[PDB]
Design a binder for this molecule. Structure first.
Ligand SMILES: CCCCCCCCCCCCO[C@@H]1O[C@H](CO)[C@@H](O[C@H]2O[C@H](CO)[C@@H](O)[C@H](O)[C@H]2O)[C@H](O)[C@H]1O
Ligand SMILES: CCCCCCCCCCCCO[C@@H]1O[C@H](CO)[C@@H](O[C@H]2O[C@H](CO)[C@@H](O)[C@H](O)[C@H]2O)[C@H](O)[C@H]1O
Ligand SMILES: CCCCCCCCCCCCO[C@@H]1O[C@H](CO)[C@@H](O[C@H]2O[C@H](CO)[C@@H](O)[C@H](O)[C@H]2O)[C@H](O)[C@H]1O
Ligand SMILES: CC(C)CCC[C@@H](C)[C@H]1CC[C@H]2[C@@H]3CC=C4C[C@@H](O)CC[C@]4(C)[C@H]3CC[C@]12C
Ligand SMILES: CC(C)CCC[C@@H](C)[C@H]1CC[C@H]2[C@@H]3CC=C4C[C@@H](O)CC[C@]4(C)[C@H]3CC[C@]12C
Ligand SMILES: *[C@@H]1O[C@H](CO)[C@@H](O)[C@H](O)[C@H]1NC(C)=O
Lengths: 825, 61, 61
């Protein structure tokens, strides 16, 4: 079912001029070559050339064939072959004496290469001494591509009981035309030429002088490839004369697929020949007792259709079990795939990216609600809900954390409770209970299929407004830092800085601005250098993967060297203590903390629970939609019901303990996904999916309280450059940003995307203007004191695309612009 | 003769794929580097003729 | 230099005597800003973000 093929050439040794046989390629269902170093290249398929096949056919149509030869040693075979050459007027009688000595010569394998110092091509002459070829020579193709352990694999691949074939090539100047000799032994016998213990059955001998359009190495490769095929081997095993071998060779040539040179080859056009090749293979096996091996091993007998992540199912809890069965079989791969240093770099980046907003929001919430909930509670909740969500989640690329609308709701609830005279930390328990009940009810009826109705319109609007608000807030923080310490002519000294610096300071604002600009510039420069060609690829990519930590370390050291100037630093709480121990505990009694809780509040607490559920559900589902789009080479499936269930349940349980509930964050998740992306020379080659990164980030956030000495030396202004870098980078994939950019270019320089060719310019501009008006309305209502009515407006965007726009544009334009898929439109 | 030489050059830079039992996609995609090398060998010379438009002296060098 | 305290009665009629608080960083900021703006306008000259006449006039200045 498989055999061994060995190809040898007549060469000369560099040390002292002599002739000998050296092996050059081996065949076990695949071709392996060896270079001048002496180490075999990687196995590959065989790709012959037109000239080799043509000359092989020409020389084989008249070559002599000896069948059922009764010989055991090489000398008897060579004698009979030379006698048959003489009989058929192939060679002159004065040439046998030299050829016999040439064939009966020592054979040296690869293991003896370094002892001699290498070999060079040689040409036999009438006298018998080597000489250089007259015609020009060229470097070999296979040894240049594939050549630039193995014995165990070689001994394993060969079946225990099989025969082997030997092919010998070499040039002789005392000849007229090339000669081919094919001899099959009557009974397989051992030979001194091959060191392997496999017996030898077939023998090829290819001789001749130099001539144009004849390369003997390629011709020997073609002969070995012909012998390697099963059909020709079976035909030779049953052939009784040369006619059967000629017919088999004609059949082999008939089923060959030759492709001509082109100008701009592509991997897409080359894949349009897939059926044709298949057909040819079938024809090759049409009239043979054998059968193909890969009859249906090239395509999956399944469908890429009805298998959709979200779909209505006739049974309860269908989505949950479907997501579990789709994702969990990849758990070992998720664990293993996290052994690259890129995972470590992403962990380091996301650690700061998730730690800073948590601290800021915790401080603001502590100063807003009279320290009912502070920083330590938020840190602990983030750590726990990150560890558990990474261990038991379906999409481990999401980052959980506190957000803005949640803070707005907390402020409104605290104000309402203060006005009505009720407690604050107790009602949150009942809100969490109602959240648990509501999420159980929703997941039980798989009511997540509504996510299908959200098109690209709302996703782009939401992402653009989030990124823009992020950048605005960063610049607002910088301007606040400027406002705290103005640029004056006089500054009072001996100011007290123990709680916080009172009054202006000399060189704070400009230093902070300089540090931010330097961090941003260094990060962008390293990002550009990642795609450069200025170093070895491995070291270049290793350096470029660690750009953000390198820039952070550089700027931290620069700030550390300066002594007298003051810059704000990161601060974390001293220990795992509750923010206010006077009126709070680790566990909250639902019945009442200091006074009894009214029954009407317990029965009416469902109303804010619905709003919280809407906010969390909408944000998480839109984030999952954006992160897991088909364009970003996401191979493993992403679940929708399991993530929502986990998040809302975890929120309720945390609300029981007094810690706040969280939700998926868009910018952090997008940054985490972009960090774990391997790009090809551009094209997104792959995305590394694993669960280690999130778990490590959560553990580090939890343990941050134990790292005061390290975190106390990191200035706050450095992270602003990182925030700006994140905000700018997270704006690349947005399509509305591109359509806004095209508002300024003249129509001569527009790209070749479908939505430019299919529709006219002033319709694209009207579309963009409508979307910008929607964005402006969203911003205005966000600034309006009626902020809690913000999410509803967002979903009100869905009917607009469904009703109003079809009354203004046409179906082709709307389908080309609002495309569900990026590549396909 | 020039057309015959060009046809010979065309035939030099073509590769044949024998009938292999490997999966179709892998076998067809294995040809990209070899074909790229062959085409790079095809376009390296591109010699036609030197700038022999006119052998003018112009009486003013 | 960058210190914690500065003298607040320093005569600067011929030349500023003694250190001053915010001169060095303001100078560095101005230099970096000028260089960055010049480079950005030089790049924008060859861009395709405006009508050619106005774009070239702006990039020339
Ligand atoms: C999820 C539904 C769809 C979301 C669409 C995208 C909108 C997301 C951002 C909107 C909510 C912003 O979230 C929050 O809003 C308030 C509204 O002024 C902002 O401003 C707030 O600042 C602090 C509280 O942080 C208050 O002292 C101040 O009175 C208040 O105006 C906050 O700085 C921002 O964190
Ligand atoms: C349109 C696209 C937007 C993306 C590009 C944005 C570039 C310009 C960003 C700078 C915006 C200025 O941001 C400015 O920040 C200061 C912060 O002290 C705010 O100042 C306000 O909030 C601070 C609290 O932070 C208060 O102490 C202060 O009393 C109050 O006036 C201003 O209300 C806001 O306007
Ligand atoms: C704009 C994008 C490019 C980003 C580049 C940003 C560069 C920022 C440069 C900060 C200015 C350096 O500021 C200077 O640093 C050196 C550090 O060696 C400090 O320290 C120097 O003096 C002190 C005391 O005089 C010595 O103890 C110290 O050995 C010496 O190095 C100086 O007191 C400070 O004046
Ligand atoms: C060694 C580290 C610290 C500094 C790296 C220097 C980087 C920022 C600079 C130096 C040379 C620059 C490259 C010079 C040549 C080109 C070709 C152009 O088609 C893409 C940009 C690119 C690739 C430039 C990117 C930025 C670049 C790589
Ligand atoms: C002075 C006013 C009118 C214009 C100032 C903006 C200029 C300086 C900046 C803002 C964004 C910058 C562009 C950002 C993106 C690219 C794409 C690249 O392929 C050509 C350069 C180009 C186009 C940059 C040129 C400079 C640029 C246009
Ligand atoms: C802690 O709570 C008590 C009672 O609500 C309050 O008086 C005190 O100011 C709080 N501590 C703070 C806000 O630091």
């Amino acid at each position: 079912h498989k055999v061994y093929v060995e190809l040898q050439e007549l060469v000369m040794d560099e040390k002292n001029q002599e002739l000998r046989w050296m092996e050059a390629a081996r065949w076990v269902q695949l071709e392996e070559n060896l270079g001048e170093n002496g180490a075999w290249g990687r196995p590959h398929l065989s790709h012959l050339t037109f000239w080799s096949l043509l000359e092989l056919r020409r020389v084989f149509t008249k070559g002599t064939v000896l069948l059922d030869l009764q010989e055991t040693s090489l000398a008897g075979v060579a004698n009979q072959l030379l006698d048959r050459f003489i009989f058929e007027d192939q060679i002159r009688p004065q040439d046998r004496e030299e050829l016999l000595r040439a064939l009966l010569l020592k054979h040296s394998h690869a293991g003896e290469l370094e002892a001699l110092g290498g070999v060079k091509p040689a040409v036999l002459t009438r006298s018998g001494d080597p000489s250089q070829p007259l015609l020009p020579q060229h470097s070999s193709l296979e040894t240049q591509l594939f050549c630039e352990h193995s014995p165990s694999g070689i001994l394993e691949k060969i079946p225990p009981d099989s025969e082997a074939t030997l092919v010998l090539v070499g040039r002789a100047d005392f000849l007229e035309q090339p000669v081919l000799g094919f001899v099959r032994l009557q009974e397989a016998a051992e030979l001194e030429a091959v060191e392997l213990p496999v017996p030898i059955r077939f023998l090829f001998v290819l001789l001749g002088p130099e001539a144009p359009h004849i390369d003997y190495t390629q011709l020997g490769r073609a002969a070995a490839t012909l012998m390697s095929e099963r059909v020709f081997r079976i035909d030779a095993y049953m052939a009784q004369s040369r006619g059967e071998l000629l017919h088999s060779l004609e059949g082999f040539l008939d089923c060959s697929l030759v492709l001509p040179p082109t100008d701009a080859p592509s991997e897409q056009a080359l894949l349009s020949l897939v059926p044709v090749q298949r057909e040819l293979l079938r024809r090759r096996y049409q009239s043979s007792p054998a059968k193909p091996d890969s009859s249906f091993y090239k395509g999956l007998d399944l469908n890429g259709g009805p298998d959709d992540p979200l779909q209505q199912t006739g049974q309860l809890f269908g989505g949950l079990v479907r997501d579990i069965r789709r994702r969990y079989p990849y758990y070992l791969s998720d664990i293993t795939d996290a052994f690259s240093p890129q995972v470590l770099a992403a962990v380091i980046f996301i650690y700061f990216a998730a730690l800073s907003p948590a601290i800021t929001f915790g401080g603001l919430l502590g100063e807003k609600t009279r320290n009912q909930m502070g920083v330590s509670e938020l840190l602990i909740s983030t750590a726990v809900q990150g560890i558990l969500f990474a261990l038991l989640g379906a999409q481990p690329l999401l980052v959980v954390g506190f957000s803005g609308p949640l803070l707005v709701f907390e402020e409104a609830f605290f104000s309402f409770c203060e006005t009505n005279g009720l407690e604050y930390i107790v009602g949150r328990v009942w809100i969490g209970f109602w959240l648990i009940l509501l999420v159980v009810l929703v997941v039980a009826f798989e009511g997540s299929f509504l996510v299908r109705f959200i098109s690209r319109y709302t996703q782009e609007i939401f992402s653009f407004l989030i990124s823009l608000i992020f950048i605005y807030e960063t610049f607002s923080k910088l301007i606040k830092i400027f406002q705290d310490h103005p640029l004056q002519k006089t500054y009072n000294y001996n100011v007290l800085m123990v709680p916080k610096p009172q009054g202006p300071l000399p060189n704070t604002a400009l230093l902070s601005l300089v540090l931010m600009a330097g961090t941003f510039f260094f990060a962008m420069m390293l990002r550009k250098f990642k795609n450069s060609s200025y170093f070895p690829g491995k070291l270049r990519r290793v350096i470029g993967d660690f750009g953000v930590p390198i820039s952070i370390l550089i700027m931290v050291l620069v700030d550390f060297f300066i002594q007298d100037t003051y810059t704000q630093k990161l601060s974390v709480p001293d220990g795992f203590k509750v923010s206010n121990s006077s009126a709070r505990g680790w566990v909250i009694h639902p019945l009442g903390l200091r006074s009894e809780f009214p029954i009407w509040m317990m029965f009416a607490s469902a109303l804010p629970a619905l709003l919280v559920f809407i906010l969390i559900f909408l944000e998480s589902q839109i984030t999952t939609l954006i992160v897991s789009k088909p364009e970003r080479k996401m191979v493993k499936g992403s679940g929708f019901h399991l993530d929502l269930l986990l998040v809302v349940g975890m929120g309720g349980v945390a609300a029981l303990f007094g810690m706040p509930w969280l939700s998926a964050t868009t910018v952090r998740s997008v940054t985490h996904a972009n960090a774990l992306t391997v790009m090809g020379k551009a094209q997104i080659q792959e995305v590394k999916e694993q669960r280690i990164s999130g778990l490590l980030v959560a553990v580090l956030v939890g343990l941050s309280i134990l790292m005061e000495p390290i975190l106390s030396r990191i200035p706050l202004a450095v992270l602003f450059g990182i925030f700006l870098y994140m905000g700018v980078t997270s704006l690349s994939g947005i399509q509305l940003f591109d359509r806004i950019l095209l508002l300024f270019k003249p129509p001569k320089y527009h790209p070749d995307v479908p939505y430019v060719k299919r529709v006219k310019t002033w319709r694209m501009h009207l579309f963009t203007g409508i979307q910008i008006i929607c964005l402006a309305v969203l911003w205005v209502v966000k600034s309006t004191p009626a902020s809690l009515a913000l999410p509803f407006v967002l979903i009100l965007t869905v009917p607009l695309r469904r009703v109003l726009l079809p009354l203004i544009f046409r179906n082709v334009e709307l389908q080309c612009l609002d495309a569900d898929d990026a590549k396909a439109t």
